[PDB]
Amino acid sequence: CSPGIWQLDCTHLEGKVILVAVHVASGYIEAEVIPAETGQETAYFLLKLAGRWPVKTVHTDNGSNFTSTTVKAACWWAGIKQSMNKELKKIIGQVRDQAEHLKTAVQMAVFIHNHKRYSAGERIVDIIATDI
Amino acid sequence: CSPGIWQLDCTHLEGKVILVAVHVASGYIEAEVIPAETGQETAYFLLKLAGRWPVKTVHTDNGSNFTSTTVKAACWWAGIKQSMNKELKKIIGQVRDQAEHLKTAVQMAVFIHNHKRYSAGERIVDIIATDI
Ligand SMILES: Cc1nc2c(c(C)c(C)n2Cc2cnn(C)c2)c(-c2ccc(Cl)cc2)c1[C@H](OC(C)(C)C)C(=O)O
Ligand SMILES: Cc1nc2c(c(C)c(C)n2Cc2cnn(C)c2)c(-c2ccc(Cl)cc2)c1[C@H](OC(C)(C)C)C(=O)O
Incomplete structure (x- = not known):
């Protein structure tokens, strides 16, 4: 798949929220625990992901998560546009x-x-590098 | 330089602590704000870095930061062994x-x-990929 597509979803476990980002074409994962499932935590997570990997488009299984002006601003600043959670x-x-x-x-x-x-970590570097 | 060498240092700004990790051979940076300059924050940061990039050896300008059993355990589990902060x-x-x-x-x-x-992000992927 395209080298800049990431899937982002917010899952739950032990009463806490785990945000999971998946590099679609590679299966590489970046996941963190956040105190609440708020747009401020999503926006801040996107800004981190974008600065470390080429994040061009983001998909999700809950479109309502990308509706806050806070999240849209992060997507705007970083130039971002719009299964695995059980393995983890x-x-x-x-x-x-x-x-x-x-x-x-x-x-x-x-x-x-x-x-x-x-x-997964070896495929992503090979994919991102090949595109370079 | 070797593709697994990271430099890690804890810097200060606005009364808060910023932990800065630098991929020596590439200049690629991963940095985060932590509430306190404790070994628990260092250990947890190392576990994050290791899971996202191949971290083989870690250097620092303050050796005393890697003396806590908490940090040494993280280095043990992830198989880790033992200028830029002004640009940032x-x-x-x-x-x-x-x-x-x-x-x-x-x-x-x-x-x-x-x-x-x-x-810096393009060099690291090229370095890590070349080594693969
Ligand atoms: C704290 C905060 N609140 C925000 C935003 C935005 C865009 C809005 C609308 N609000 C509510 C608001 C602000 N003023 N008013 C009157 C209401 C951002 C932000 C800044 C830069 C980017 Cl690229 C993306 C988001 C942040 C940043 O924090 C994070 C943790 C990232 C949310 C920050 O540190 O500024
Ligand atoms: C909370 C915590 N305390 C720790 C350690 C360790 C090794 C020690 C000695 N202590 C003090 C202690 C524990 N028992 N006693 C009686 C005293 C770790 C840890 C677990 C796995 C790895 Cl690879 C590396 C460190 C953690 C982990 O949290 C972070 C945020 C990572 C520090 C966690 O979530 O377990």
Whole structure:
């Protein structure tokens, strides 16, 4: 798929919100725990993702998340335009005993996902690099 | 330089702590605002960085930051072993008026730094990909 398409969704676990970004063409994931499922957390997350990877278009399974003027401004500033969450939840449960806070287990699961085999982290760098 | 060497340092601005990670061979930066300059924030940051990029060795200008058992455990789990901050502070001041919170301005400055020209974000993907 195109090298700039990211899918972004907000999932739940242990009463907390986990925002999951997936590089469609590669399966590479960037996920974080946020205190609330607000537009301010989404906007701030998009600004982080955009500055680290080429984010050209963003898709979601809940269009209402991209309706806040806060989120639209972030998409405007970064020049952004408009399944996997169970695989991650699977990994989180496997490593959940190794961590106290859920945020730590989430990052443990992101590490495992991106580096497990080529791997998702290896495909994205090859895709983004090929396009360059 | 080697494709897995990252430099990590904790800088200050507006009474808050900004942790800055720099991919030595490329100049690519990942930076975030943390509430306090504690080992728990460092460890959690390392776990995030490691899961998104190949982090093999980490250097710092303050060795005492890597002495906490909390940080050493993160380095252990992720298989990690053991100038730029002014360029970023320069960009943060330029865009500071465009944001209320310092964390937003930091990510704005990371975006600008990595994508400004090849750019730092383009060199890192070419370096990591070449090594693959
Ligand atoms: C909350 C926490 N405290 C920790 C550690 C460690 C290793 C120590 C010694 N302590 C103090 C302690 C624990 N028990 N006692 C009696 C004292 C870790 C940790 C877990 C896995 C990895 Cl790879 C790396 C660090 C965490 C993790 O949180 C972060 C935010 C990452 C620090 C978490 O969520 O478990
Ligand atoms: C705190 C904040 N509130 C915001 C916005 C926006 C665009 C609106 C409308 N509001 C509500 C508002 C502001 N004034 N009034 C009277 C009502 C942004 C922002 C700034 C730059 C970008 Cl590219 C994208 C969003 C932020 C930033 O914080 C994050 C954590 C990113 C949300 C920040 O630090 O400025």
